[PDB]
Structure formats: structure tokens, C-alpha cells
């Protein structure tokens, strides 16, 4: 604590886009920042994105780049990914990472993982 | 169609308060989705504990209890022990047929 | 307890029709309900299905809607579901689920699944 | 084909009695089938109890015995310990082969 | 114990022929009886076949009675099993399984299970 | 692109000190890297022990301690206990995103 | 090619003495084949215990000894403990190039 | 103690190279050799290569005496694995192996493994 909350699962199918969620129960927004991290098993975990809520400044790679988006929402406040154009190589869980990194002390908390199944 | 959702992970100590959402994509869970709670626990034993929002299962202690909140159900748990450590599920009823959230992971440390 | 219960497992292979069973240990089939929930690995637990003994009520859904029926039985006492044209894709634990939502106290108990395999 | 039919899980306390079946797909199992009783536990480990119906592995204890019921074959354990959570497959002799029910899964909790 | 005794693992190829064994340490071959049951994983167990040393009697079914095929030897003592034009499908983990069934007490000691890999 | 490497395994003893090391395949590990150091534990839970090469996560204890050393970074456990046993993962900032290393399991006996 | 064999498990009690034994398919297990046993548990983690048939790793007890039995290697394990269950793998030394059983998996109950 | 020092885990495609490292912690390169074992799930561990830092002794076998290829290095002291042509059969864990074998005491103390994944 302080604590991050994204949801337990979600399934698609190839071809659909989805969205995922990350909350931050407790903190400031408007200071911090966010990440997106890809676990498949025996991949390790693999570093997605970015994201930040006023002008913007959401940073992939040129793999990510298309498909996979990261974003904000600012009256319940909540971090966003979308991957357009779901895979069957899109399955995982993606983990989002939380807090500080503007000089205060410390540390990120990280969100529970969302399982994304596609499909059945 | 329906999507029910739960967060994916809670950490805990033992004498401390948890609590477990679980929303309706279709609008508020309300008292005719009977908010069901199932812990599973490893090697795929699931448990119902409580069924229609707040009714326990017999010898579910009194320290489990569900209700609404707001637009949403919860499952609070009073006291956690190191024996509450399990996958807590959500299911609700759409006029015939449940619909699973992907189960909250409860961490008690320890 | 009270205590549902069903088969360990069974092996199916693909296009044939295959049967899985819900029993009651102590209950009143006349006044309850029961579903089906497939569970594969990293699909979660997925609602199926429902039944009523008397006249009827067995309620799926618009992919379920075709192979996938539930049914009972009197003398004995016992809940199905089929699985007509099996498919490789069919292979998991189906979970049966029991008692109450009459306007009484208690819960269900769930069983303990089948493992379907399909083929070997 | 022959099938056997044993249920997939129960759950037990220590110091309580629990009973396992097994039904055989061609009519009732008799004592020409040779019920046999396998306790598996965490890696694959499969350990004979009973053979032939009621006949025990030398050392296991009085408390584990083999029956016919009706036209089935039970595995009872008698003051179930925290120990004899495993998994019990059933075996019945058709002649000159083994046929394997699914497994029993046995919850001790705890 | 009395106990049984196979080999850790073995590692074929497609279209090869192996042979797996299953020794007993401390009984009477001349009596008693063997058997072969395959472990794949969500397949559970399944029985394969059997066998006597003398004249003969190694039992299987009308999908095993092709490749599989099971055997005895004297002098050292022990039981086999064949599976010719081995195949990816043939995976798994086969136990072999022991003694009485003559008239005496006791009973068989599972082996431990041998792992067949096919192919890398 | 940039590959974190650390090491795959250590083996300690209770109330010894451990250490991880982290390197950068761009060069050195620099506090521009802001070295992340999060603990793994079963059942895929993740835990950010510390951020920004040595600053502490509320009530991570001061045994754990981040550096760095060299050209690579540091993460130093002193004291282990048997709860220490856990999968430590480092994480490295280049500019805008992350990059994992494949972590270190440690183990404890006992 | 060289096959090394095996036994796939072995079940022992505490207190009490076990053998594993490691055959060569190309004729007598050999001193030229330094025969070499590693422990492995849990979570892909292996420890070498003796190398060149007898030779313990600094700190394996002496209650661990190999040697050559006939034409097989040997390894026995004095008044087991519960710690001292493993999976057991033996390595054969062919002139620039080891090869491996398939480990035997010890039980010790409890 | 001694130990062995390799790399958590190493991403690459098909077609590629990789290298991975075997480091000593407290020894002498000059006396002692090395091993690298590949474990695949259900596979067990199958024996690779080996090496010798001054003229040389690397010795594989016939279907490594291809792509896979061992080495040294001196200043620092290390030991090579090369995996040309990367497959996407060529994910494991790639076990080294480390001290002694000269005719003192002691014991080789098995590296960590390095998890190859190919690809994603
Ligand atoms: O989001 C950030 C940062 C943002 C701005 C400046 C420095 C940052 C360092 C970080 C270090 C680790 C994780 C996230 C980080
Ligand atoms: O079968 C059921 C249920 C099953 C599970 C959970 C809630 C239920 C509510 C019901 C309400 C009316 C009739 C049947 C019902
Ligand atoms: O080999 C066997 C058996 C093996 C397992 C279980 C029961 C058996 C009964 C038998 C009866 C007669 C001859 C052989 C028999
Ligand atoms: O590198 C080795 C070995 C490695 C493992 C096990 C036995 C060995 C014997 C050796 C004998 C001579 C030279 C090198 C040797």
C-alpha cells in the first residue's frame, strides 16, 4: 500500500480490440507515471509502454506501435493499454506498474496482472 | 454480452479487513444478479461461500459477508487468517445463466 | 455438505456425443436449479448452461445453443449435459453447481468437475 | 468400451470417515473385477493400497478398507488424517486388462 | 516393498522402436502378473496391456495390439513393453505394475513410471 | 535494442548477505536508469522492493539496499531469512519504457 | 549412441538407507566415466553432490557416498532426511562429453 | 561455493545467433573444463558440448556439430555457448556446468540455467 487495481481477466477474440484498466487507490495523477508489462510464460516479462494524462506522452516501440495504445481518465482517474487488432499471440497477463518518480520517496506498487485469453 | 470484473490481486495481513469487488459491465449489480462468492483454493477445489449477495454457505464464519455497494457487489473478509489465502470468484445471474469474473487472488502475508 | 456429485472423467473423440453427470447427496431436485461452468486453463471458468426437471428450462447460450444440452433425471435424481459433436476445443473441466435460491437459507456446493480429454 | 466411474472430489476433516466408489459400465462390479485402490500423490507418485476388493498392501493401516456396496466397489477411510489427502484411482480387472476410473481427489482440511 | 523397478527415461524418434522394463526386486516372476498403463497428462491413466513368462499371455486392445506388445526374460528376471513405429502421439509416462494375485496376501508396488520423450 | 542481464540463480544460507548484480548492454547502468528491483513471489505476484537505483518501498526493512557498483547496479539483502526466497527482477529506464532483466531466483536453505 | 539408466523413483523413510544405481549401455560403468550424481529440487535448481564416482562437493555430508557396484555406479544416501528429497540425475563422462539418466525421484515419508 | 555464473534468461527469433555466459566466481580457467546441458519439459537434460581456453577442445556431437559451438574468454574469464540458426526448437534452459577434474578435491557447482526463448 498504496495499492493498484486492474481487472482479474478478459477474453477476445482475433481480430477485436481491448482495453485494459490500472487504478490507483490513494494517490496523484497528476505527478506520476505508468507502464504496461507483457508476461508470457517463458518469455519473461517483456516491457510494453507508457502514458501521461494532461498533453500526453505514451511511449512504445516499433513493435507496439501499432496495435498496442496507452492512455489515461481523469474524473475517476484511470491508466489505459488497447491492443487493436487482437492476436492469438496477444495472450498473457499484462502487468501495469503505479507511483512516484517526480523526487518524493517511496515506490510503485505493482497491479495484479490481467489475464487476456483469444480465444475460445 | 455481460462482463462481470474483480481485481486481479489483494494482499493481506492476518487480523486485518479485506474486501472484494465485482462490477456488472450491464449496469449496478443489483439483488436480482444474487452475487455469488466461490473461494478456490489449488488443484481446481472450488467452495461457495456465499450465494444471492449476502446469504452464507453452512459454516462459512461470520467474518465472510457480501452485500451491494454503490453499483457494485463485495465480499469482506473480518480477521483474515493464513487459511484465507484461496481465489476468490464472483458470479452473477442474468435471468438464467451465471456469468464468472476472473477471481480475485488473495495474498495473506502470512 | 450437502454435496454434489460427478464423474472424475471421461474420454471422448472428436464427432461423437458424450454425457456428464450431476448428483445429489441429501437434496430436494423438485425446488432448486443447476448450471454447467467450463473451466479451461487460462480461459477461466466459463457459464454454460441451466435445467429445470418438470416441465423445463435448460438455458445456454448462442454457441452453446447447438451441441451443448442439459437435462435431469427422477428415480435416482440427476442433472446432465451433453456434448454432441465433440470437438478438440471441448477439452476441459466441466463444473456442475447445486442447491437453494428457492427462498430458503444455505448455499450450493460445488462438484468437483469432469475432465473431459478429447482425443487419445 | 468398459468405463469406471469414481466421483472427482471429496472434501473431509482429520478423525472423519470418508467413502470412495467406483461403478463399473458393464453392470456391477464383482470380485472377478479385483477392485484396486491406488493412492496418488504430488509427482506422479502411485502407491497400491488395495487389491482383489479388500486385500491391504503390507502396511498400510486397518483404518483403509476395500468393499463391495450394491454394485459398486468402496475404499472407506476410517480417522482420515491430514496425510491422506491424495488422489485414489480406481482399477477393475476385465479379464486379462486394467480399466482406470478418473481418480478420486481427497481434500483433508486439514 | 516389495518394490518395482524401471528405467528414469527414454528419448526416441518417430517411426523407431522401443522397449521399456520393469524388474522386481525380491519376488517370484513364475507366479504372479505385470501390467502397462499409460500417463498422459488429461488423458489420465490409461491401461495398455499384460503378460506370463511361460507359454504366454501379454494382453492389449484393438489400438495397442498393432505396435505395443509385452514380454518377460528369465535369468535376470524381467518384464517388457515394445512400441514399435513409435510416434509423436506415444509421449508419456508408462508404469508398469507387480506382484500377487496367485491366492496369497499383499500386494503390487506401482514402478515409478517411465517418461518417454519422442522426439528432440 | 537494450538487454538487461543478471544472474540466474544464488543459493544462500539464513542471517547471510546476498547480492544481485544488473548490467546495462548499452553501457553502464546509470541513475538515469532509476534501477528497479521487484521481488517475485508464487503464483506470479510481484512486489516493487525498491525504485530509482536505492530507494525503499514503505516497509521493505533496511536489510534490502540498492547501489550501484561499477558499471552494473546492486541489490544487497542482509541478513536473509527463509520468507527472502523469491524471484528478484531488474528493471531499467531508457528514456521512456522499462527493459527486464530474466531474474534472479534466489534460494534459501533454510 | 550411450544410454545412461536409471531407476525413475525410490521411496525411503528417515533414518534409513537408500541406493540409486546409474547403468551404462555401452558395458561396465567405469572409473574413465567419473561418474557424477546431482541433486535436483524444486524449481529447476541443481547441485552437484560427487563427481569422479566417490568425490563429495565441499559441505555434501558424509552420509552421501558413490562408488562402482559391478558394472553400475552407485550412490547411497546414509539415514535420509526429509530434506534429502530430490530428483537424483547421474552423469556419465564419455571421453570429452557427458550424458544423462533420466533421475531418480526419492521419497522420504515423511 | 564455488559458483557458477550465467544469465537469467535471453530472447531471440528464428534465424538468428545467440551467445550465452558461464562465469567463475573464485577459480582457475587454466586447469578445469566445462559443460553445457540443455533441458527441454519432458526432454530431462540432454548433454551438449564442451571446452578448452588454450589451443582449444570444444567437443559437440553430429547434430551439434552444427549450430551450437563452444568457447572461452580470458581477461575476465568466461565461458561460451553459441546457438547459429536459432530454431524455435532451440528453447530450453541451457544448464553449465564448471570446476575441478584436474586431480585434487572438490566438486563442479552447476550455473543457474539461462532460459532461451525463440520467439515472440
Ligand atoms: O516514469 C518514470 C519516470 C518519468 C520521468 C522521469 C524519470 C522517470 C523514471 C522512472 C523510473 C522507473 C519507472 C518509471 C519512471
Ligand atoms: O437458479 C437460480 C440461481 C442460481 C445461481 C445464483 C442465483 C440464482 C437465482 C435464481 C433465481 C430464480 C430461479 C433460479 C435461480
Ligand atoms: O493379473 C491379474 C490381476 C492383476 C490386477 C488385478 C487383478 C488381477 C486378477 C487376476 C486374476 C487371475 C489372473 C491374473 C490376474
Ligand atoms: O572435463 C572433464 C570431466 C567433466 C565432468 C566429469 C568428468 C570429467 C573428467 C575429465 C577427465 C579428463 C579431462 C576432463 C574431464
Same mark, same amino acid.
Given at each position: 500500500?498504496?495499492?493498484?487495481?486492474? /481487472?482479474?481477466?478478459? #477474453?477476445?477474440?482475433?481480430?477485436?480490440?481491448?482495453? #485494459?484498466?490500472?487504478?490507483? /487507490?490513494?494517490?496523484?495523477?497528476? /505527478?506520476?507515471?505508468?507502464?504496461?508489462?507483457?508476461?508470457?510464460?517463458?518469455?519473461?516479462?517483456?516491457?510494453?509502454?507508457?502514458?501521461?494524462?494532461?498533453?500526453?506522452?505514451?511511449?512504445?516501440?516499433?513493435?507496439?506501435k501499432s496495435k498496442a495504445t496507452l492512455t489515461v481518465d481523469k474524473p475517476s482517474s484511470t491508466a489505459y493499454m488497447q491492443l487493436s487488432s487482437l492476436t492469438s499471440e496477444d495472450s498473457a497477463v499484462y502487468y501495469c506498474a503505479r507511483m512516484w518518480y517526480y523526487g518524493t520517496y517511496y515506490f510503485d506498487y505493482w497491479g495484479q496482472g490481467t489475464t487476456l485469453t483469444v480465444s475460445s | 454480452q455481460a462482463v462481470?470484473?474483480?481485481?486481479?490481486?489483494?494482499?493481506?495481513? !492476518?487480523?486485518? *479487513?479485506?474486501?472484494?469487488?465485482?462490477?456488472?459491465?450491464?449496469?449496478?449489480? *443489483?439483488?436480482?444478479?444474487?452475487?455469488?462468492?466461490?473461494?478456490?483454493? !489449488?488443484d481446481h477445489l472450488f467452495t461457495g461461500l456465499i450465494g444471492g449477495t449476502n446469504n452464507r454457505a453452512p459454516g462459512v464464519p461470520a467474518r465472510f459477508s457480501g452485500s451491494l455497494i454503490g453499483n457494485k457487489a463485495a465480499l469482506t473478509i473480518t480477521g483474515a487468517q493464513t487459511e484465507d489465502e484461496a481465489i476468490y470468484f464472483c458470479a452473477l445471474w442474468y435471468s438464467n445463466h451465471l456469468v464468472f469474473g476472473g477471481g480475485t487472488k488473495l495474498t495473506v502475508l502470512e
Open positions: 500500500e498504496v495499492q493498484l487495481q486492474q /481487472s482479474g481477466a478478459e #477474453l477476445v477474440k482475433p481480430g477485436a480490440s481491448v482495453k #485494459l484498466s490500472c487504478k490507483a /487507490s490513494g494517490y496523484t495523477f497528476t /505527478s506520476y507515471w505508468m507502464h504496461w508489462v507483457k508476461q508470457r510464460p517463458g518469455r519473461g516479462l517483456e516491457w510494453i509502454g507508457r502514458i501521461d494524462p494532461n498533453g500526453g506522452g505514451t511511449k512504445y516501440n516499433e513493435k507496439f | 462481470v470484473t474483480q481485481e486481479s490481486a489483494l494482499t493481506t495481513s !492476518p487480523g486485518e *479487513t479485506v474486501t472484494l469487488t465485482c462490477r456488472s459491465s450491464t449496469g449496478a449489480v *443489483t439483488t436480482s444478479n444474487y452475487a455469488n462468492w466461490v473461494q478456490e483454493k !489449488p
